[PDB]
Design a binder for these strands. Structure first.
Length: 74
RNA sequence: GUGAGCGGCAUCCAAGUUACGCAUCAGAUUCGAGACGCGAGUAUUUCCCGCGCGGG
């Protein structure tokens, strides 16, 4: 690691304003009165994963030319 | 088929109310528009400066 790992936060949510508008206009076929952010189709979710600056080094037994060619497209 | 693949930190909120750049301080003390332009000196050549002629 060239620097300390950073805890990256990401969420996921469906805009309830747009969902309500679509439900009103008939675009969305939903009968439920309210969204449920704790669970269901309109659930908000909070998750984290770490981000690192790193130099990846690994050792292998194989063909240099073909491995380098494969890694060229990565 | 890279413990991969998939995933909105997003919504809402007044920096505002009140407050004298003000009080006081000599542009003063001295001095003339009144003075300053030649009626000043003999007769015919003398040492010389540029070179017959210009000129001490």
């Amino acid at each position: 690691k060239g620097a300390a790992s950073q805890n990256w936060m990401q969420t996921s949510r469906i805009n309830t304003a747009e969902a309500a508008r679509h439900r009103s206009e008939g675009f969305l076929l939903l009968r439920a009165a309210k969204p449920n952010p704790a669970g269901g189709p309109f659930k908000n979710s909070l998750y984290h994963y770490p981000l690192v600056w790193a130099t990846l080094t690994a050792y292998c037994v194989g063909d240099q030319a073909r491995i380098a060619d494969l890694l060229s497209q990565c």
